[PDB]
Amino acid sequence: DVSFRLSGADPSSYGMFIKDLRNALPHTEKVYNIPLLLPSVSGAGRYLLMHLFNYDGNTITVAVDVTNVYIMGYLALTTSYFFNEPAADLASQYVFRSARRKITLPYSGNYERLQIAAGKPREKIPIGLPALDTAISTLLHYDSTAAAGALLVLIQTTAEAARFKYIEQQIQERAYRDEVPSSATISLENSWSGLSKQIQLAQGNNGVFRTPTVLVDSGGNRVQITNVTSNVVTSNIQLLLNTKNI
Ligand SMILES: *[C@@H]1O[C@H](CO)[C@@H](O[C@@H]2O[C@H](CO)[C@@H](O)[C@H](O)[C@H]2NC(C)=O)[C@H](O)[C@H]1NC(C)=O
Ligand SMILES: O[C@@H]1[C@H](O)[C@H](O)CO[C@H]1O
Structure with a gap:
């Protein structure tokens, strides 16, 4: 537990x-x-x-x-x-x-x-x-x-x-004062299954996503994630949903 x-x-x-x-x-x-x-x-x-x-x-x-x-x-x-x-x-x-x-x-x-x-x-x-x-x-x-x-x-x-170190950090920032989630947080939540799948498809595809994932970044701008070298893959996501469940 x-x-x-x-x-x-x-x-x-x-x-x-x-x-x-x-x-x-x-x-x-x-x-x-x-x-x-x-x-x-x-x-x-x-x-x-x-x-x-x-x-x-x-x-x-x-x-x-x-x-x-x-x-x-x-x-x-x-x-x-x-x-x-x-x-x-x-x-x-x-x-x-x-x-x-x-x-x-x-x-x-x-x-x-x-x-x-x-x-x-x-x-x-x-x-x-x-x-x-x-x-x-x-x-x-x-x-x-x-x-x-x-x-x-x-x-x-x-x-x-x-699932996401960025969301853990957002909550730590709200330890003593709540605030609505950033647009980036919502994006990450909504993208977890897609990111998990593309990270697994990239094994077999030289680190490249079969299909780009669109995220909102920390500044509110929409960005395309296309391969494993992205900070979302190297530093942020902590758990992958198995493609067998997607
Ligand atoms: C893999 O992803 C990186 C981004 O994480 C791509 O490089 C970026 O994309 C363009 C240049 O082509 C710029 O807008 C960014 O500033 C680049 N960033 C960095 C750190 O290089 C890269 O093109 C992708 N590679 C493949 C093979 O898809
Ligand atoms: O099915 C999903 C999962 O429960 C997610 O972690 C939260 O919301 C739902 O849409």
């Missing part, structure tokens, strides 16, 4: 958490020195448990599928909650089975359905360590509309930061 406490959190302890989260994900190979997540894991071992504690010390446990870093559901006190999607229903066969009751959220876990549920795109929802403390708190008691925005904060501040 991995854990993160908001009480006394700072950029250093958040970075220790994101490092523990990356290191908990199994891999057998690296591709261009980036860990390649597994095609598949059977049974309970598919799910990592992330114990998150709000500033008051209240806790939820979040289940994350280790092949794709997708959050499947969470336990808060004696109730489990899962997204309304078959991968999550599958996860509910393995994790939090000792919950006294199980609620299926009224949406799946993808960004488009979550933003519809929340009533706002994630361009407009501040993220940071304080937003994550709020998100944990929100999830402690069921409210499906509030939970969709809490989950948009939770996914970005845990999974997306694990």
